[PDB]
């Protein structure tokens, strides 16, 4: 087929205009070649398929040698002819050759459709499994929300799909991989070896996995769950005058509690923004950075959105004020200081909006629309969502709106902070009073008479839906739909984390993030020794361990050369911490000379080194003769179970040798065996052209070109011809290392910051 | 893999007498045995065997320094005398995983006096009433099991 | 380009950028090029300053990451580039003091201590020595050189400053760079560090120009004096002031909208001077007369079954005689009996075939060769008597009494059911069996109603007649008008009413006209009320005994023409049922969300704790009667079958207008007080449809009569 | 074949690791059923 492609494409420069286009339109400009079809589309497709289906051969076979199979007629009925065709250059046929052949004929491959199309499977045994319920008749309250119409498998941005995808079937075309490549190896990996066996179009592979990846989103009228899920089978769930019950057949705390924790640990020091953009590219959520799933959700929670802005990611343009999310709708108001009397007697000059303005409000699950005037809020109307989202959205309005009536509420004192020892502006310290007395704005609020009306009704001080509303408030039985135009705008990010709109006005503050800690449900492991010294003793050896397995390479390499540098690491130093000081000099000179005798006289053992590795930051105290003290149980702070085991395991730590893993701290590693040949399984995702970097023009002298099997075969350091995307011929050398530009950025930044602060 | 492989990776092709150890796990044996140990082997210490679906102890080289020996998770079900008349100087026994019907299983063992820890875990023979008891007083010279003598102490 | 520069930058480096921009006085915004220059400028910095270090004997080698020795960990080179430009300067001034080096006289970007020498770092877009000459001449040799290319090209002042590992990394992020502009369309946009200070050119030019001089509102001679007004003056009332002199004869005369303004629409029908209404539909749709045959079940052509039809009744097969009841107005009667005669010898022949074996008869009993020639135009223009014809208007007609028999006739139960339905999947989700139950009641209902055999029919022939047109082209074809009807104890008759001539369909085009005559078999005799049947000759063919009542057949003959759009319609026209059973549908939905349990059998059939569903029907006497739920699903299903049949231009005219008075007369019944602009105009605008379409005319009669019983029922 | 068993961990008693499974199954009683748990107490009174 080769030689066809030279022989046609020799006859076609043999015409002039074909050598002059060609020598003419870059590869790039190659797109525009493409679409200038002649766009002649068929008018009324029903009618033209129905005249086809009625022809003598309307089917369109593509020339080859699958039609010797078949006779040109069978039994009597015409199937396929031998005229030329002009449109396609192929033959003719009729759908009877098409029934006969899923009749008889070749019998092809059954496994390529267990994997390939993974997802329309598990579709199907998401329905299957289900367990259906009652129907309700009555009315169904549905709100319209921004809702994936399909589950993900990973969701990414469309180009990262594209590039992901490319690097998965097309092992060809793969020059220089970005910064995607390594944060999705695993899938990477996985959907190679699933898709590997297969002999389907790469074309059609290429859409299901942008169909797999890609996210879709659309508004949709929904009530109850949201989730992928549910939204599949929201045709026969949902309904206008009837529900149904249906259950089909996580990460996202861990990373709200993440960011959370990067944004206090940065907010304390100076310059934050930069020390929070290393600690988020340098954290991992078990696979991946944390731009893996801060990506793949939209917006989220306001320490996300800070994060996100930090990073380089999307993030939905609404205003966030302690929790309330403000869209506005017209007007303009003035931001100018004024000097107030606070209803304490004390007097505070803080920033007052003067003019009319109404905003789209939402908090949790509660809805509704706001209009206010300086120095007082005139409307809000709402509906009834949940007792504590509609508290929290009446207080953090009311806070908002800077209603004189609010001022004079206040009857305690305001001098709080955070959890950082920071004092924050009036108006958050307010919010906070107001959110920790909330019946202290509410008694003298004033009441105002129920709204007589069809629908709206009036809900009390206490959230019932009780007559004798607040001055105000009103909750109508109808459906808030708020928040269009998500348009996220261009957003700019100080060095103290609070974002910017295009001009100067002040979007999200630093201190929006709500000081509530939880419990990170996976394993949030970090790369910087500056964050894990908050922590319990667990999560300290768990992050040491993370950072030894991570680069295990550079430590095992250091292990030969047997020098005391390997030891004093800065990452080992958080661990001193939790150790005894009265016994830990006595556990590093165990360690050293058990690790001493390992590599004397014995071979590798991974397991032992990293169990034993980290004990010997201390310096050691010897026998009063000289020799190592022995121990076989390293107690660690805390007592009881804070123990590691010397000989096999313990709870925090135990590798099983029969299937070769690993168990810290409760939880399961894979580590597949010793030895760089499991180092290179690790490496068995990666990408196509990921050890090779770049350098220099053609360079004829290696000849011709050399492919991806054969590179692998030159040594360290060698000069390549490889062609780059569709072409470029380029030179390039094999690499010695792994390479993680991140980690390069940060570095330089710190020291230039190390620099500007030592001549300061 | 084969016991053949585990023997010469352990021994490294080296003289027999030259490890006190040996680590029989996940190796398929003929029939449920323990192949590929030569009684040519003069000097061990410690021994290994799990996941090796031995069914019978048959096969065993004379031995007068062994001190453990370590069996789990295989459906052997016989009379253990033979380890007397093999290696009479067992100190830590364990058939934790084994299979062993009644406690008649288990009564061979009186002949050997060296022996002092004995593990059976999840065994048929564990689900009844005063096993403890009776295993002690069927066994005086044991001074451990599976750990709950008196005290508890490690191996 | 700035969505760019985020996604591929790091916020630091935008950081760094952004700040020597504001030094400079330089908007980022207004020149993005040169922000994502800088950029690239510091990431490059960065990158080659990256994980090099100097041992203790001062021998450059790598140092690992994340792994600290103490304190110093002294790096190779020392990044001066980013900072300051106060701080830069102090910089380089202490590391020239502190190394006893010449202070450069310009800032440096890097330094390297194991050198001990000032480094810059340089990219462009052409060729590295070139750039790297212009450099060398501007600064000279007091500092070292390393450029860097897109195109995987650099020059280095020394060789062996950068290891193979740096310079093939930093090519590799500029060679991504590159790639992901040109994927972005950005690289040939971008424009380096020479023409980065010139900006986009796009001048106009002098037609132009000239054009948007001219172009330019009244008062204004030229579209820079438009430019200079617009971004100068500032309106502060403008639109106040013209309102205060706009003549006050200009408003929407707002009036408020009572019951007693509206009136009934189009007067026009009840006035008896007028002709009535004739029958314009394309097929018989109450008077069908069914030659049915009991068939075994079998499926056959056309063709085999109106021959099988016709030889059970050999009567009407081999009549020869006809007695003509009336020729219309212009038909010819030899014409059309002989073509019917030839219709059924050919029917009746032995040959599959179903072409006519005239071909030269039908030409002119179907009128194609009574057609005018086209001449060019030169002839027309000299020609003075080819004028232009006239516009032909439709006539403006009367109520008739044909079109309420069949709408009522139409929705009644008939023993005999034709719509059958594919089957579905089993049904395991209790909705779905909801669905099943709604969905059996509801075809339980609408199967045995004559119209649904009538909506089978147009539909089974117009198909046969696309098929037909689209196998044959330039030939003459006969088509049966046929039919299967299954009865309640599962015979399924075959029924034939009638045969249709297709003349020749060679269309290029879905507009043109094809022409069709239609032979219909009928039991009614037209006497008893001529005026429905002004457009049909009809002849006496014989007559039939059903059970023992002997009753008249006759033949009506009529020449008609459609398009490939009706055609293909005919087809589509199913979607009657759809639109028959979502109202009914949302309605039995309206009474599920008042009590909880479903009513689908309540609503139907009634139940021992509700009355079955009862609308308003019909009327009697001026007596309105109410009807079961049933046969207001059949009213309604009979009124989408006719809003199909009788659908032209005029009717889409005439619903979509009267809708504005339905939607007032809605807001008048809820007491919304709606108040109009001008009436009389939308009167106007509806009534102008209603001059020859029956349903147009039987929907303003009902429209009058329902808005009639409105406003004596507004008295409460 | 009633209960649904996870692992959760390991428990060490003499320096040996013991799995450790988490039986979970739903039952449902009355609240007469609660009084006659309540009153299982008697086993020691019938025994005596």
């Not at chain 1, 030329?84 to 003719?92: A, L």
């Not at chain 1, 070896?193 to 009228?221: D, H, Q």
């Not at chain 1, 958080?574 to 000379?593: H, N, V």
Request: glycine share 6%; aromatic share 8%.
């Amino acid at each position: 087929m080769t030689l066809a492609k030279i022989e046609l494409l020799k006859q076609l420069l043999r015409d002039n205009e074909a050598k002059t286009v060609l020598k003419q339109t870059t590869v790039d400009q190659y797109n525009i070649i493409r679409k200038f079809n002649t766009s002649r589309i068929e008018k009324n497709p029903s009618l033209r398929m129905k005249w086809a289906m009625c022809s003598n051969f309307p089917l369109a076979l593509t020339k080859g040698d699958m039609a010797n199979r078949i006779p040109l007629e069978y039994k009597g009925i015409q199937l396929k002819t031998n005229a030329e065709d002009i449109g396609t250059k192929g033959q003719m046929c009729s759908i009877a050759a098409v029934t006969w052949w899923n009749t008889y004929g070749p019998i092809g491959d059954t496994e390529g459709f267990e994997r390939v199309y993974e997802s329309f499977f598990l579709r199907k045994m998401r329905l299957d499994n289900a367990t259906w319920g009652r129907i309700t008749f009555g009315p169904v309250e549905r709100v319209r929300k921004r809702v994936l119409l399909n589950p993900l498998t990973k969701e990414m941005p469309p180009d990262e799909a594209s590039n992901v995808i490319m690097e998965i079937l097309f092992p060809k075309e793969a020059g220089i991989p970005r910064e995607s490549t390594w944060i999705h190896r695993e899938l990477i990996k996985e959907k190679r070896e699933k898709l590997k066996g297969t002999m389907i179009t790469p074309i059609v592979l290429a859409y299901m996995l942008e169909r797999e990846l890609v996210a879709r989103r659309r508004f949709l009228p929904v009530a109850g769950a949201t989730s992928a899920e549910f939204i599949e089978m929201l045709h026969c769930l949902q309904g206008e005058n009837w529900r149904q019950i249906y259950h089909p057949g996580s990460r996202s705390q861990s990373m709200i509690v993440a960011c959370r924790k990067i944004i206090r640990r940065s907010i304390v020091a100076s310059n934050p923004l930069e020390l929070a953009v290393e600690i988020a590219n340098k954290t991992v959520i078990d696979t991946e950075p944390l731009k893996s799933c801060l990506a793949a959700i939209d917006g989220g929670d306001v320490a996300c959105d800070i994060i996100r802005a930090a990073l380089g990611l999307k993030i939905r343009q609404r205003q966030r004020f302690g929790r309330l999310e403000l869209k506005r709708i017209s007007g303009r108001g003035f931001k100018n200081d004024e000097e107030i009397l606070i209803g304490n007697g004390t007097i505070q000059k803080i920033g007052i909006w003067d003019g009319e303005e109404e905003f789209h409000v939402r908090c949790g699950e509660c809805r509704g629309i706001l209009k206010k005037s300086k120095m007082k809020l005139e409307k809000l109307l709402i509906n009834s969502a949940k007792k504590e989202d509609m508290r929290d959205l009446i207080i953090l309005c009311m806070v908002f709106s800077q209603d004189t009536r609010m001022f004079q509420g206040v009857r305690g004192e305001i001098n709080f902070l955070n959890r950082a020892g920071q004092l924050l502006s009036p108006m958050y310290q307010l919010q906070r009073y107001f959110l920790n007395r909330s019946n202290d704005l509410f008694d003298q609020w004033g009441y105002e008479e129920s709204p007589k009306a069809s629908e709206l009704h009036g809900i009390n001080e206490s959230m019932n839906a009780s007559d004798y509303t607040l001055k105000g408030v009103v909750v109508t039985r109808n459906v808030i739909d708020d928040f269009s135009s998500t348009e996220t705008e261009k957003v700019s990010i100080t060095k103290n984390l609070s974002l910017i709109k295009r001009t100067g006005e002040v979007i999200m503050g630093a201190n929006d993030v709500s000081e509530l800690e939880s419990q990170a449900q996976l394993m949030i492991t970090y790369d910087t020794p500056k964050m894990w010294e908050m922590g319990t003793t667990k999560e300290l050896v768990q992050n040491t361990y993370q950072w030894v397995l991570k680069n295990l390479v550079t430590l095992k390499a250091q292990f030969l050369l047997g020098k005391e540098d390997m030891f004093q690491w800065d990452a080992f130093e958080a661990f001193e911490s939790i150790i005894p000081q009265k016994m830990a000099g006595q556990y590093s000179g165990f360690a050293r000379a058990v690790l001493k005798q390992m590599r004397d006289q014995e071979v590798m053992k991974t397991d032992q080194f990293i169990k034993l590795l980290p004990f010997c930051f201390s310096p050691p105290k010897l026998r009063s003769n000289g020799e190592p003290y022995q121990f076989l149980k390293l107690v660690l702070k805390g007592g009881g179970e804070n123990f590691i085991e010397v000989r096999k395991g313990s709870p925090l730590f135990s590798y099983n040798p029969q299937t070769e893993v690993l168990t810290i701290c409760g939880r399961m590693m894979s580590l597949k065996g010793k030895i760089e040949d499991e180092e290179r399984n690790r490496s068995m995702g990666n990408a196509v052209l990921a050890g090779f970097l770049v350098s220099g023009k053609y360079d004829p002298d290696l000849g011709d070109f050399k492919t991806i099997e054969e590179l692998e075969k030159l040594k360290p350091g060698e000069k390549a011809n490889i062609l780059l995307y569709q072409g470029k011929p380029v030179k390039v050398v094999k690499r010695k290392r792994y390479s993680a530009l991140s980690n390069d950025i940060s570095q330089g930044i710190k020291r230039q910051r190390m620099t500007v602060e030592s001549m300061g | 893999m084969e016991m053949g492989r585990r023997i010469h990776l352990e021994l490294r092709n080296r003289t027999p007498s030259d490890v006190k150890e040996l680590v029989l796990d996940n190796s398929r044996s003929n029939e449920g045995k323990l192949e590929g140990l030569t009684d040519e082997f003069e000097e061990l210490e410690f021994l290994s065997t799990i996941n090796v679906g031995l069914t019978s102890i048959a096969n065993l080289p004379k031995l007068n320094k062994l001190k453990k020996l370590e069996l789990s998770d295989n459906r052997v079900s016989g009379g253990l005398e033979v380890l007397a008349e093999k290696c009479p100087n067992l100190t830590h026994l364990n058939l934790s995983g084994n299979k062993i019907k009644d406690l008649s299983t288990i009564e061979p063992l009186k002949k050997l006096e060296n022996l002092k820890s004995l593990d059976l875990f999840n065994c048929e023979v564990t689900n009844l009433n005063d096993y403890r008891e009776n295993v002690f007083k069927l066994l005086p010279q044991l001074t451990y099991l599976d750990g709950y003598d008196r005290d508890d102490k490690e191996a | 380009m700035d969505t760019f520069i985020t996604r591929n930058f790091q916020t630091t480096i935008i950081q760094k950028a952004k700040n020597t921009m504001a030094e400079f006085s330089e908007d980022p915004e207004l020149q993005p090029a040169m922000l994502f220059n800088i950029c690239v400028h510091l990431e490059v910095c960065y990158v080659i300053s990256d994980m090099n270090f100097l041992d203790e004997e001062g021998k450059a080698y790598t140092a690992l990451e994340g792994q600290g020795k103490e304190q110093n960990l002294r790096p190779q080179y020392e990044v001066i580039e980013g900072m300051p430009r106060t701080i830069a300067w102090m910089v380089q001034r202490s590391l020239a003091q502190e190394h006893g080096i010449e202070t450069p006289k310009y800032l440096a970007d890097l330094f390297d201590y194991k050198t001990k020498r000032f480094i810059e770092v340089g990219i462009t877009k052409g060729l590295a020595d070139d750039y790297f000459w212009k450099k060398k001449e501007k600064l000279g040799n007091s500092m070292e050189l390393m450029i860097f290319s897109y195109n995987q090209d650099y020059s280095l002042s020394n060789e062996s400053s950068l290891d193979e590992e740096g310079k093939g990394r930093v090519l590799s992020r500029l060679t991504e760079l590159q790639a992901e502009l040109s994927l972005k369309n950005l690289w040939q946009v971008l424009i380096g560090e020479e023409d980065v200070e010139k900006g986009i050119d796009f001048k106009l030019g002098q037609t132009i120009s000239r054009l948007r001089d001219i172009s330019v509102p009244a008062g204004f001679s030229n579209f820079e004096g438009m430019r200079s007004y617009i971004d100068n003056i500032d309106p502060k009332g403008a639109i106040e002031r013209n309102l205060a002199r706009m003549s006050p004869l200009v408003s929407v005369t707002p009036k408020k909208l009572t019951w007693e303004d509206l009136r009934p629409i189009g007067p026009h029908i009840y006035n008896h001077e007028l002709p009535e209404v004739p029958y314009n539909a394309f097929l018989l749709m109450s008077d069908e007369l069914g030659l049915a045959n009991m068939t075994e079940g079998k499926s056959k052509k056309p063709k085999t079954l109106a021959k099988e039809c016709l030889e059970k009744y050999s009567t009407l097969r081999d009549q020869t005689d006809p007695i003509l009841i009336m020729k219309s107005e212009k038909a010819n009667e030899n014409f059309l009996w002989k073509l019917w005669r030839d219709c059924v010898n050919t029917i009746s022949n032995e040959e599959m075939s179903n072409e006519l074996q005239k071909t030269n008869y039908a030409k002119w009993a179907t009128g194609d060769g009574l057609t005018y020639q086209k001449i060019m135009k030169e002839v027309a223009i000299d020609d003075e008597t080819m004028c232009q014809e006239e516009p032909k208007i439709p006539n403006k007609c009367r109520v008739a009494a044909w079109v309420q028999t069949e709408m009522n006739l139409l929705s009644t139960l008939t023993s005999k059911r034709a719509l059958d339905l594919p089957e579905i999947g089993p049904d395991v989700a209790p909705v779905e069996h909801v669905g099943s139950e709604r969905r059996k009641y509801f075809v339980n209902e609408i199967n045995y109603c004559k119209a649904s055999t009538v909506m089978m029919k147009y539909v089974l022939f117009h198909t046969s007649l696309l098929n037909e047109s689209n196998a044959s082209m330039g030939k003459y074809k006969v088509i049966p008008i046929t039919n299967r009807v299954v009865n309640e104890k599962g015979e399924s008759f075959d029924m034939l009413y009638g045969l249709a001539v297709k003349g020749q369909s060679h269309l290029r085009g879905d507009t043109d006209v094809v022409t069709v005559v239609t032979f219909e078999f009928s039991s009614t005799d037209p006497r008893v009320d001529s005026g429905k049947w002004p457009k049909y000759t009809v002849f006496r063919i014989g007559s039939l005994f059903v059970s023992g009542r002997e009753k008249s057949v006759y033949l009506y003959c009529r020449v008609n023409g459609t398009n490939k759009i009706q055609m293909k319609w005919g087809m589509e026209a199913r979607r009657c049922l759809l639109q028959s059973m979502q109202q009914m549908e949302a309605i039995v939905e309206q009474e599920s969300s008042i009590q909880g349990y479903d009513m689908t059998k309540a609503c139907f059939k009634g139940d021992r704790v509700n009355s079955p569903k009862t609308f308003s029907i019909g009327t009697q006497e001026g007596k309105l009667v109410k009807g079961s739920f049933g046969k207001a699903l059949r009213v309604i299903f009979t009124k989408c079958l006719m809003h199909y049949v009788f659908g032209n231009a005029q009717l889409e005219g005439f619903s979509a207008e009267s809708r504005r008075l339905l939607l007032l007369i809605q807001a008048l019944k809820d007491r919304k007080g709606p108040w109009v602009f001008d009436l009389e105009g939308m009167y106007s605008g509806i009534e102008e449809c209603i001059s020859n379409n029956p349903w147009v005319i039987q929907s303003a009669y009902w429209f009058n009569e329902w808005l009639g019983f409105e406003k004596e029922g507004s008295k409460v």
